[PDB]
Each structure stands twice: as structure tokens, then as C-alpha cells.
Write a protein that binds this ligand. Structure first.
Ligand SMILES: *[C@@H]1O[C@H](CO)[C@@H](O[C@@H]2O[C@H](CO)[C@@H](O[C@@H]3O[C@H](CO)[C@@H](O)[C@H](O[C@H]4O[C@H](CO)[C@@H](O)[C@H](O)[C@@H]4O)[C@@H]3O)[C@H](O)[C@H]2NC(C)=O)[C@H](O)[C@H]1NC(C)=O
Ligand SMILES: CCCCCCCCO[C@@H]1O[C@H](CO)[C@@H](O)[C@H](O)[C@H]1O
Ligand SMILES: *C(=O)CCCCCCCCCCCCCCC
Lengths: 11, 326
């Protein structure tokens, strides 16, 4: 998920 | 009987002494000492001084960094513009009128200043909702084979404007009204007065449900699912320390986002509710000023949580503030 988490500015 | 009333207002003070004046006409220094009007102005000063740089910098830095203009950031930008409306249409106007001790722009100045002040914080509110929906959609993959892109990001933005007009526009037309509130230096929706001519009561319910409960539910569900999806993934992933870190920061962040939303709309909710079910009772000008103190400061803490604490935004900001290098 880290890829989508990065996109969302969450991680 | 707790206050004195007029064609366009309600002053939270008794006229039994004959001292009460139109908030559109003369100073309110019987509602509160003048230094308290200064303090209110001092507070408005703080929020502009902090609210403007940090929100404007957001727009500016987006202009300078290509990696920032992406569909998922569109709503974050919308939050910044929303905050700016709050800063100019609300905070400065209030700085100005507070220094007169009354709302010097009159009934039409009240409508305008009230409309923009309301439009701003409502766009900001629904922005926080839309953001959550998107993050839910993108991270939780609830739809199969669906990829979020430019055309969805536009609608999300547009949807917050339709929602915000669905809130701010009606009092201009006779469903509720805008009137000076609190110390009567600033105008807002009349949720506290049972003014039957404008149907204030059916509006405060519709406000409470559509513009509070819906947002609260959506934001809890969406972020709830996320802290689920991410905790699930880490438990199935434990050989990855990075996936472990991620699930830890995303949770902390969701706690901050959720607490922050409450600190902003709960006082306005708790007070609107209490007045509705407390109707015989008397509510002072400063007390009505409190839930407003809370909702307005969001124009500062929201972009700190949602922008400065966002890794990508913060970096570009440190680059830009640091004169291009670092
Ligand atoms: C808070 O309470 C005060 C006191 O009740 C109230 O202020 C009063 O308002 C009336 C206006 O409605 C003022 O009446 C005027 O007084 C002066 C005399 O000094 C005259 O200019 C006026 O005379 C005209 O009107 C009269 C009838 O309306 C006629 O008799 C006359 O022939 C003229 O047509 C008028 O009498 C009054 O002076 C003030 N009093 C004070 C102390 O300010 C105020 O309106 C209340 N606050 C709110 C928000 O309503
Ligand atoms: C930062 C912007 C400050 C703008 C000007 C504020 C001016 C307040 O102005 C004062 O209001 C009084 C009533 O309260 C009047 O009696 C005074 O005559 C008037 O000078
Ligand atoms: C490019 O490298 C410029 C770098 C240094 C910027 C230093 C800025 C310090 C700002 C301190 C706070 C100033 C405003 C205080 C207002 C009350």
C-alpha cells in the first residue's frame, strides 16, 4: 500500500 | 427575556436600562468592555498573521513545484483557498469592525461578510470530507479496477462548492438569515433565535444533519476503513519494517485529523444543540463567541495538519523558504 499511502501524503 | 431585538439583529443584552443600540449603528461596549473588543481584534490579528502566510505559501509553493500539482493534491489546494476566504472575508473585516465596537457595514455588509465567512469555512469543511473519501477510495480499493485521476479530482473540488453554497446561500434567500453574532462585530447564521419568518429551526436541523452529522459519519467511516486496511496489511506483512512504520504514522495521523475535526465543529454543534433543546435560557455575547473562536482557528491548524505535516508539501516549502537550496 505504501505507494498509494505516499500519493496521499499520509506516509 | 434575555436580549433586545430589531428588524435585522438580536443583541444579547437587556434594554431595560435603555442603553442598547443597533449593532449596525453604535458601539456595543455594554455587551463587553472595550479592551475585550481589542482582544477580539488582537485575536483576529493572530489569525491573519499566521493564517495568510501559511495558506498563501501553499498556493505559491504549488506554483513553484511540478511534483505538487497532481489530482490528489487538488482538494488540498481547495482547502488553502477556502482558508483564504476565511482570512479576508472574515478575519480582516472582523479586525476592522471590532475596532469600532460594532458592525459598521450595516445589514447588507452583514449578508456579504456572513456569506463569505460561511462559504469559506464550509468549503474547508467539505474539503476535509472529500479528501477522506478519496483517500478511502485510493488506499482501500473499494471499487475494482478503478484509478483516481484528474476528472474525479475536479468533481471533488466542485462538489465542495455545491455543498458550501447549499449551506451559505439559503440565508441570503430567507432560509435562516445573517445577523451580527456574539459581540456583534461579525455576522453568521442565526441558529440561536427562533425567527419563524425565515424558518430558522428547520434550517438548524438541516445544518446539524447535512453539514455536521453527514461530515462526521463519512470522515469516521472513511478513515476508519483506512486504519483498518493499513493495519491489516502490516499484520500480513511483518517481515517489512517500513510497512510497520507506515501503519503507525497513518494511524497517528488519522487520530490527529479526527480530533482536529472535532475540536473545530463540536463546540458549534454542542452549542447549537443545547440552545435548540434549551430554548428558554439566556446566552451571553462572549459564550456565543467561544464556538466561533474554535471554528475560525482551523484556518491555521488545518493547513498545519493537512499541508505542513504532509511530507511532499513540507519539503517544497522548506526549499522555497530557504531560498531555493536545501
Ligand atoms: C433601547 O432602549 C432605548 C430606550 O427605550 C431605545 O432608544 C429610544 O428610541 C426612541 C426611538 O424609537 C427615541 O425616541 C426619540 O427621541 C427623540 C427625543 O430626544 C426624538 O428625536 C424622537 O421624536 C420622534 O418620535 C416620537 C415617537 O417615536 C414622537 O413623539 C416625536 O414627535 C418624533 O416623531 C423620538 O422620541 C429615544 O430617544 C431613544 N431613547 C434613548 C435613551 O436612546 C432603543 O431604541 C432601544 N434599543 C433598541 C435596539 O431598540
Ligand atoms: C487596522 C484598521 C483600523 C481601522 C480603523 C478603526 C477605526 C475605529 O474608529 C473609531 O470608532 C469609534 C466608535 O467605536 C468612533 O467614535 C471614533 O470616532 C472612530 O474614530
Ligand atoms: C533564504 O535563505 C532566507 C533564509 C532565512 C529566513 C529567516 C526567517 C526568520 C523569520 C522569523 C519570524 C519573523 C516574523 C516575526 C513576526 C512576529
Amino acid at each position: 500500500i505504501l505507494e498509494n499511502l505516499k500519493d496521499c501524503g499520509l506516509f | 427575556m434575555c436580549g433586545t431585538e430589531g428588524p435585522n439583529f438580536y443583541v444579547p443584552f437587556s434594554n431595560k436600562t435603555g442603553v442598547v443600540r443597533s449593532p449596525f449603528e453604535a458601539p456595543q461596549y455594554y455587551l463587553a468592555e472595550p479592551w475585550q473588543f481589542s482582544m477580539l481584534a488582537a485575536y483576529m490579528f493572530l489569525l491573519i498573521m499566521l493564517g495568510f502566510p501559511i495558506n498563501f505559501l501553499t498556493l505559491y509553493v504549488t506554483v513553484q513545484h511540478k511534483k505538487l500539482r497532481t489530482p490528489l493534491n487538488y482538494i488540498l489546494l481547495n482547502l488553502a483557498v477556502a482558508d483564504l476566504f476565511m482570512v479576508f472575508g472574515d478575519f480582516t473585516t472582523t479586525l476592522y469592525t471590532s475596532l469600532h465596537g460594532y458592525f459598521v457595514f450595516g445589514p447588507t455588509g452583514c449578508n456579504l461578510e456572513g456569506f463569505f465567512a460561511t462559504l469559506g469555512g464550509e468549503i474547508a469543511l467539505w474539503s476535509l470530507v472529500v479528501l477522506a473519501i478519496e483517500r478511502y477510495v485510493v488506499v482501500c480499493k473499494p471499487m475494482s479496477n478503478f484509478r483516481f485521476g484528474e476528472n474525479h479530482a475536479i468533481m471533488g473540488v466542485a462538489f465542495t462548492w455545491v455543498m458550501a453554497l447549499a449551506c451559505a446561500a439559503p440565508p441570503l434567500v430567507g432560509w435562516s438569515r445573517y445577523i451580527p453574532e456574539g459581540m456583534q462585530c461579525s455576522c453568521g447564521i442565526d441558529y440561536y433565535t427562533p425567527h419563524e419568518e425565515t424558518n430558522n429551526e428547520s434550517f438548524v436541523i438541516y445544518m446539524f444533519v447535512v453539514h455536521f452529522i453527514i461530515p462526521l459519519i463519512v470522515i469516521f467511516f472513511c478513515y476508519g476503513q483506512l486504519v483498518f486496511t493499513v493495519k491489516e496489511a502490516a499484520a500480513q506483512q511483518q517481515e517489512s519494517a517500513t510497512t510497520q512504520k507506515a501503519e503507525k504514522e497513518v494511524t497517528r495521523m488519522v487520530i490527529i485529523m479526527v480530533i482536529a475535526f472535532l475540536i473545530c465543529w463540536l463546540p458549534y454543534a454542542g452549542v447549537a444543540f443545547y440552545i435548540f433543546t434549551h430554548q428558554g435560557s439566556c446566552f451571553g455575547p462572549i459564550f456565543m463567541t467561544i464556538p466561533a473562536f474554535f471554528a475560525k482557528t482551523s484556518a491555521v491548524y488545518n493547513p498545519v495538519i493537512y499541508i505542513m505535516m504532509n511530507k511532499q508539501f513540507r519539503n517544497c516549502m522548506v526549499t522555497t523558504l530557504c531560498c531555493g537550496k536545501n
